[PDB]
From a paper:
Receptor-binding specificity of HA is a key determinant for viral host range. HA molecules of human viruses preferentially bind to α(2,6)-linked receptors, those of avian viruses to α(2,3)-linked receptors, while those of swine viruses to both. Two H6 HA proteins, one from each group, were chosen for structural and functional investigation: A/chicken/Guangdong/S1311/2010(H6N6) (GD H6) in Group I and A/Taiwan/2/2013(H6N1) (TW H6) in Group II.
The GD H6 virus, although of chicken origin, was able to infect guinea pigs through direct inoculation or contact. GD H6 HA has an apparent equilibrium dissociation constant of 0.097 μM for avian-like 3’SLNLN receptor, and 5.0 μM for human-like 6’SLNLN receptor. The overall ~50-fold lower binding affinity of GD H6 HA with 6’SLNLN receptor, compared to 3’SLNLN receptor, seems mainly the result of an about 20-fold decrease in the association rate. In the structures, we observed five glycans (at HA1 21, 33, 169, 291 and HA2 154) for both H6 HAs. The glycan at HA1 169 is located at the HA1-HA1 monomer interface, which was reported to protect H6 HA from trypsin cleavage at R201. The overall structures of GD and TW H6 HAs are very similar, where the root-mean-square deviation (RMSD) for all Cα atoms is at 0.67 Å. Within the receptor-binding site, GD and TW H6 HAs differ at multiple key locations. These include HA1 S133, S136, S137, I155, P186, V187, E190, A193 and G228 for GD H6 HA, whereas R133, T136, N137, V155, L186, D187, V190, N193 and S228 for TW H6 HA. Nevertheless, the amino-acid composition of HA1 S137, E190, and G228 in the receptor-binding site of GD H6 HA allows the binding to both human- and avian-like receptors, albeit with a slight preference for avian-like receptors.
Residue numbers in the entry:
A (entry chain B): 1 to 171
B (entry chain F): 1 to 176
C (entry chain D): 1 to 173
D (entry chain E), E (entry chain C), F (entry chain A): 1 to 324
Amino acid sequence: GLFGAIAGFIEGGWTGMIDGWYGYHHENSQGSGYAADKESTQKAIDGITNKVNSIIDKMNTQFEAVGHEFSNLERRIDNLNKRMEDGFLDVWTYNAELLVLLENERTLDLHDANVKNLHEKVRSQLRDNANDLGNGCFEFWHKCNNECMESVKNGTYDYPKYQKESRLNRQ
Amino acid sequence: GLFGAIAGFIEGGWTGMIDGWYGYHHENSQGSGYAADKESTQKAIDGITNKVNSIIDKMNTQFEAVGHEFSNLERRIDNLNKRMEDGFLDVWTYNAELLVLLENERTLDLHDANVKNLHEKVRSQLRDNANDLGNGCFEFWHKCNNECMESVKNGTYDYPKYQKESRLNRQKIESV
Amino acid sequence: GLFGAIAGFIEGGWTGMIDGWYGYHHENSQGSGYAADKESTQKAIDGITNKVNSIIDKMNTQFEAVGHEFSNLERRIDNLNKRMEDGFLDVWTYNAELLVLLENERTLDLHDANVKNLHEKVRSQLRDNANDLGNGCFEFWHKCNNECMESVKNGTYDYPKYQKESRLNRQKI
Amino acid sequence: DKICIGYHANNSTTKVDTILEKNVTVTHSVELLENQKEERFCKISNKAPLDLRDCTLEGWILGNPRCGILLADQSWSYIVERPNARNGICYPGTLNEAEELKALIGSGERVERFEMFPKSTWTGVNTESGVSSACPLGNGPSFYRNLLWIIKLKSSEYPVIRGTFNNTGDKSILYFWGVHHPPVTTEQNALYGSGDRYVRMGTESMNFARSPEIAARPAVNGQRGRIDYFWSILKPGETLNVESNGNLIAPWYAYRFVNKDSKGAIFRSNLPIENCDATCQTTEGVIRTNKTFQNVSPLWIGECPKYVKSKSLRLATGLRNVPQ
Amino acid sequence: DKICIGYHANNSTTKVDTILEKNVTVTHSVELLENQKEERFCKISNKAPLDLRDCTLEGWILGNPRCGILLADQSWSYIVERPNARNGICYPGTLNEAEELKALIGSGERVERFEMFPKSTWTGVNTESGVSSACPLGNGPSFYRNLLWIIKLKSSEYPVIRGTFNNTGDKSILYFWGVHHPPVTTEQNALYGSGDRYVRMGTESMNFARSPEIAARPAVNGQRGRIDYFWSILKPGETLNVESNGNLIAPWYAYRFVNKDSKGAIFRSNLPIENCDATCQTTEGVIRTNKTFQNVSPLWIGECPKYVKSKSLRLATGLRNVPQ
Amino acid sequence: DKICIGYHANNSTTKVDTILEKNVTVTHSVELLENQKEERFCKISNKAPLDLRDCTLEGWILGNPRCGILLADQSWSYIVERPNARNGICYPGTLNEAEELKALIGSGERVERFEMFPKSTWTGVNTESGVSSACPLGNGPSFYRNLLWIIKLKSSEYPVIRGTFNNTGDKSILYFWGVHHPPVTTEQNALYGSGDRYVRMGTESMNFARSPEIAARPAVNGQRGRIDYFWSILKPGETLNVESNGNLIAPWYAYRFVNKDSKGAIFRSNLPIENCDATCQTTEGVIRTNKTFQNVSPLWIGECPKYVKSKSLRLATGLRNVPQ
Ligand SMILES: *[C@@H]1O[C@H](CO)[C@@H](O[C@@H]2O[C@H](CO)[C@@H](O[C@@H]3O[C@H](CO)[C@@H](O)[C@H](O)[C@H]3NC(C)=O)[C@H](O)[C@H]2NC(C)=O)[C@H](O)[C@H]1NC(C)=O
Ligand SMILES: *[C@@H]1O[C@H](CO)[C@@H](O[C@@H]2O[C@H](CO)[C@@H](O)[C@H](O)[C@H]2NC(C)=O)[C@H](O)[C@H]1NC(C)=O
Ligand SMILES: *[C@@H]1O[C@H](CO)[C@@H](O[C@@H]2O[C@H](CO)[C@@H](O)[C@H](O)[C@H]2NC(C)=O)[C@H](O)[C@H]1NC(C)=O
Ligand SMILES: *[C@@H]1O[C@H](CO)[C@@H](O[C@@H]2O[C@H](CO)[C@@H](O)[C@H](O)[C@H]2NC(C)=O)[C@H](O)[C@H]1NC(C)=O
Ligand SMILES: *[C@@H]1O[C@H](CO)[C@@H](O[C@@H]2O[C@H](CO)[C@@H](O)[C@H](O)[C@H]2NC(C)=O)[C@H](O)[C@H]1NC(C)=O
Ligand SMILES: *[C@@H]1O[C@H](CO)[C@@H](O)[C@H](O)[C@H]1NC(C)=O
Ligand SMILES: *[C@@H]1O[C@H](CO)[C@@H](O)[C@H](O)[C@H]1NC(C)=O
Ligand SMILES: *[C@@H]1O[C@H](CO)[C@@H](O)[C@H](O)[C@H]1NC(C)=O
Ligand SMILES: *[C@@H]1O[C@H](CO)[C@@H](O)[C@H](O)[C@H]1NC(C)=O
Ligand SMILES: *[C@@H]1O[C@H](CO)[C@@H](O)[C@H](O)[C@H]1NC(C)=O
Ligand SMILES: *[C@@H]1O[C@H](CO)[C@@H](O)[C@H](O)[C@H]1NC(C)=O
Ligand SMILES: *[C@@H]1O[C@H](CO)[C@@H](O)[C@H](O)[C@H]1NC(C)=O
Ligand SMILES: *[C@@H]1O[C@H](CO)[C@@H](O)[C@H](O)[C@H]1NC(C)=O
């Protein structure tokens, strides 16, 4: 099912992030920008490439009808051949068309899960050192420089390092 | 693929909410009541309707057996026709029976996800202005009238407006 | 899709837990140890067994080719018979091979979701009486003995019972 | 003050099956399979089916004298043949390419019965006295109404007889003929004559020839002799030339044939044909449903749901039903 | 004090494929496809198969004189025919509807060999000396054991011979006969005679008559002559009348036939038959498994897993294995 | 200071269908179905197809005199026959097992044309003047180049004529023959003679015999007579004996045949054959694509994508497109 992120609590996408499917937008004194998430984007590409290739590969056989002819006294086996040829045509049409419907659903949900997981990955590190706006953004309770931003992306964010500074800001 | 809500951390359903699949139950000085979330419910209805229609639509062809006859000297092509007709019958039976099993799973999981997402949606606005009971309910740390209740469902809940009143009531109840 | 737990925020599995698929590891004054959660594990076994059995059961018919022979003047119905035999062979090969790919995915994701749900179930009981480390572990703000651990696993953990001891340890720090 | 998020529940006991779990009670579901039938035959496209009654398909188009009720113009939506109909090929013999004929007629919608060759076509022979107790009309002996059994005059020899039909219509013509095979040479010489005798038919697209095959056979319907029956299609603009010096069972009445523009059907059934209408007609009965599947029969003509072996195909629409 | 939630891991190196990722190590899995076979033939349902050995199916059922090892009643679970069997139709000619014959016998369970027409049926003729070097037994000439080659006595003409068999049994009867086509007029006059000759076979449902077609054909086994072989089924209650004044290869021994109530098989194979039992027997060998699919062969008898082209079909049951 | 998690969006308006929702805009997708073709025929495996041009398959392989451009050695990847080709079976009659013939040739790669029986084979007869206005070459009457119409000498009778061909090559030989059926007894006596006439062909594996069937038929191409055409395969090492006392249409030229090791094709089409290359060649044209599916044609030679009825099959790769 829907994982609630895409067109969810993150209401829209970024036309400004062009180097990846999932990523970050950061803000501090050193300026701003979009940056793709390097881990999740590549892994998604690998999986979807695999899905597309795997689907193509399982579709890589063909029922081949023939142009054989039948006399006016062969009407029964003629019709037999036709019902068979139409039979497999309808089976493979069903398989192809339904697979596309079902897997398109799965693919879109896959991205949704990837975005949600990416968001929780970040939310989990920042903890109470950041203010969750609920829309996919986090406001820092401390000064967060470019390297600080990088640490979040690496998933290596140092919580106890900034813990006291964040906590002391209580109005 | 369970999302943990239905027969999950929300232990049971509401026979009292009859106007929708997913919704709210509120309590305040003005009383209580059930209300369906029409947005998430209607969207689900459209999706399930679409799934059923799409399935019916892909099942909209038929292999048609015929009543042709064969002589006692035509045994081979008789059996050929029979193995073919039984062939597609077993194929379509397989397709139909397995699809029902698989997609019933997905449909039920879909509802679970919808309840979960609607729940996270409310939790995200209330934040620490409310007490998460873990059962799908939130106790407000402030007074929430009907207009306050409406904003939560509708998604316009004003968090900082109630922030001050809420924070004093978490302090007053704690023994520190 | 991924539910983020398996090979996720819980980085790896436990070779030390041999009695179940999903479970716990505890540490306290009385020592440490692994324990399988038997409820969620059994439910998974029942579901997977049913899935496997149902798949086998829908595969429980066979298209049977025959060894009938055809003369040199029967080339057309011979070729017809072969294209039919190869026809159903390709359909069932496709069905089997693709079903395995898709359902292996679903099965692995199912385990992921079960671990995730199990993790939130625990997180919900402990609340702020424990510190969420983000790796699937919880540091208790109070002393949690073997019986206390059992209550968490068994799902009967008494929150207000430990609340004051927890807050005073958060107060002193 | 509190607010709770939750989901619908109702009084439903309806269950569906899932891949992980069987018998799951759900709030809403839809059945896709139809198991209901009216055991009877109705009209397809407001056109009545043809009941063959006490006659077999072969008995009808050959014009068995006991099939008189059926010998006329016919327009059918489909054909109903009764399992044990007694009136078949009354005079013993093989219908050549019988199954292809059944397939042809099944693909047809209408036939117009007309007299192809009047009795006066064949002169110098006895075109009367060609009847048999094996093919009775009423109590008295008779013969097929679409075939003419010609026997020799004892006065003259059996002359070479000829007939011609030029098909100038737009409709194809289904016609029949035969070759008589007497049990003993005595009868062969008495009915036709000595020497080599032949029956020869030809058109622009067909060339036919046979000779009598005299053989002693077991009695069937009091007859040890045989007739090899044949059928063919005279295409529009084509011409049929008939030439024989003996043993000829000549075409008499034939059918102008109209090909059905869709699949036709021939049902083997005991079910009553009634005054009713149907969109979907199976061999087991009428299906009236909006459902996608049916377990009733693989054999049908109108617009029917897909046939499967399933007892039920129920899709969950609502959610897992969990009343408190 | 702390508690962690986690998941199982073990020493499994077994891998499965998923739609998003290949070669994924899992803790538990089950293989659905069987690729192992015992290359041999075993018994199905406590019944031994029939090895045709050095004889072809036609050679067996016609009774080729070198097939004596097979000359008896036969009951088979299935039939094994050897690729290069030398003993077939020894005397050159065509068996009409050969492939339909194999299909019928393949659909059979048991045949009982009996004498249909004893030599005393045919009077006024030579029932001995009906042999040829084309069908040798040892060095000396011989003939099929189910057929009687009748030739004229040196003294008299070939008289009209007659025979009758009423099938009063409940079992269908498979019988064979033939029409001899000598190469030259010399042999025709010497073996049977001048004038028009005939072979006449008939039942309630069949009418057969032929004359000899004298022609010199390329030599096969020293023979410019030919025999047209035929086979048929005498239904229970039916009667066969045989009438001939020459060139008849008469039915001698025939078979009472028992229809197999399920699919039969005829395997063309070199595999040895052993003393063993099997539930699933393919043409490539025996499969013993509780698995759902098999990689061995599409051609089999008994209860076999579905045939697919796959090398492996492995379902994941456990989860992704992540040891530490 | 803040950080946000988000996802890609762009100007893509490309849509896909899902099970829950139709017309869903996505950032990235791939079309799996190919609807485009070059309406023409190209080379498969760098080998050109055979253009039959103005001749039907029968007219070509029988050697219709107007098909002379094709009467030579031929090597094809596949065969193209044009719908309304004028040069067919010119002398009226039926080609026996025509559809099996077309199927065999379609399974072929190459034919080598050689002279099987030269006119000098047949002694005591007239091998010239064997022509007809129904098979004209230019203005003058003519006949097939693979067939010899043999008639009686003016002076002598039609003697029993014989011919023999031993096939000592490794390739099978495709050959043709016929039986002439005059409309009236007069012509039969004039061309061949009275009494019983026969046409007899034989090999180690084949037995063929026919007699003239004299009958008055409707005129086709100014001919009331007919020819029954036959074809067969002389296996390597086999021998063909031809024996006739009349009414023989003799084999003259035949073909050394090369069996194709895979499926061959015969396309009935008006599309032009060109010097070009294709991996996938359909009957409707060439498909050049990396796509998995195609809606163009079920009939093809070479390596083609799977045929379906779909108008589009588009898989989502990227995500739901949601610009700011
Ligand atoms: C989603 O968000 C809010 C949920 O209640 C709604 O915004 C509130 O709706 C009130 C009810 O209509 C509006 O009423 C105003 O205030 C009083 C009610 O207290 C009315 O009598 C007035 O007519 C009206 N206008 C003024 C100037 O008072 C409020 O505008 C508003 N309240 C607040 C605090 O913002 C949205 O309408 C709702 N959207 C829906 C239902 O579509
Ligand atoms: C980015 O993350 C990686 C790990 O994901 C960091 O590398 C680790 O550094 C620690 C030391 O602090 C080592 O104990 C680990 O073994 C390292 N991991 C690996 C895989 O080698 C890396 O330092 C991070 N980069 C920054 C700038 O913080
Ligand atoms: C699922 O529901 C069916 C409802 O028919 C149950 O079927 C009954 O099961 C008993 C034994 O358990 C059997 O006698 C019959 O199959 C049913 N009895 C009836 C209809 O009286 C079934 O048990 C349920 N559980 C499954 C299939 O696991
Ligand atoms: C069917 O056969 C399979 C494989 O031959 C058996 O598989 C096992 O399941 C048991 C369950 O307790 C495991 O302990 C075994 O380890 C499995 N086998 C392997 C090789 O891993 C199975 O026992 C059979 N079916 C049933 C119902 O038992
Ligand atoms: C067929 O080949 C085309 C190459 O022209 C493939 O399309 C390209 O795919 C790459 C990788 O995603 C893109 O960067 C290009 O923009 C695509 N070019 C297009 C769409 O014109 C296409 O994916 C291939 N199709 C299949 C089914 O393999
Ligand atoms: C209650 O349940 C019955 C059967 O379980 C159903 O027919 C009915 O529609 C339901 N609702 C009512 C009675 O209001
Ligand atoms: C009758 O057939 C002849 C040819 O035999 C020809 O005149 C025409 O096709 C038919 N006659 C008419 C008037 O159409
Ligand atoms: C893996 O460990 C288990 C548990 O001890 C045991 O089966 C064995 O040691 C290993 N399995 C294999 C197949 O080697
Ligand atoms: C994955 O499958 C098997 C592993 O046993 C191997 O043969 C194959 O090469 C592997 N594929 C890749 C890309 O490594
Ligand atoms: C064969 O025997 C049965 C005995 O049931 C008899 O009724 C029948 O007439 C016999 N057939 C012939 C041809 O005599
Ligand atoms: C499409 O791209 C252009 C160029 O980058 C930019 O204006 C915008 O993203 C889109 N254009 C419009 C008119 O929306
Ligand atoms: C989707 O796109 C086309 C537009 O004509 C058509 O299939 C349909 O009307 C549209 N809407 C839906 C819901 O399919
Ligand atoms: C055909 O020719 C070969 C020559 O290699 C010969 O051995 C064989 O006996 C011949 N067959 C005949 C004449 O029937």
